[PDB]
């Protein structure tokens, strides 16, 4: 399946900051690579073939990861949906996405639960 690289995650964040606003820059050099590398390793190791579970893992990992000074939630959401789109899943905006992403970010909504919602919306 087609994954999102750390540098792509960063570029997506930076483009989002430019378009919508927010504080620039990364919290800690290396964290993007650490987190996204972890996601991809886990997907291989756990043999996760379900696109919605994988999208959810990107979403939760970035939302909780504090890779950036700002727009972590935006980057989390857009990257998850970019992931779905690259893998042939049509995506569209839904008024449920904001609260979903916040819930993921605060640790209130698990990967499994995020995947369940994405699957309802887009599957």
């Amino acid at each position: 399946m087609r994954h999102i690289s750390p540098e792509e995650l960063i570029a997506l964040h930076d483009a989002n900051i430019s378009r919508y606003g927010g504080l620039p820059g990364m919290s800690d050099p290396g964290r993007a690579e650490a987190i996204i590398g972890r996601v991809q390793a886990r997907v291989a190791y756990e043999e996760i073939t379900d696109l919605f579970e994988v999208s959810a893992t990107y979403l939760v990992a970035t939302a909780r990861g504090y890779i950036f000074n700002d727009a972590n939630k935006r980057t989390a959401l857009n990257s998850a949906l970019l992931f779905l789109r690259r893998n042939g899943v049509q995506v569209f905006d839904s008024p449920e996405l904001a609260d979903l992403t916040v819930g993921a970010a605060t640790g209130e909504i698990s990967v499994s639960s995020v995947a369940d919602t994405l699957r309802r919306l887009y599957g």
């Binding site: 970019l82 995506v91 905006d93 904001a98 992403t101």
Partner: peptide, 18 residues
């Protein structure tokens, strides 16, 4: 353009979350 199209699609939610 990869990103611009994605942001266009999710423009509402992106704005909401700022």
């Amino acid at each position: 353009a990869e990103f611009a199209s994605l942001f266009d699609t999710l423009d509402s939610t992106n704005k909401e979350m700022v």
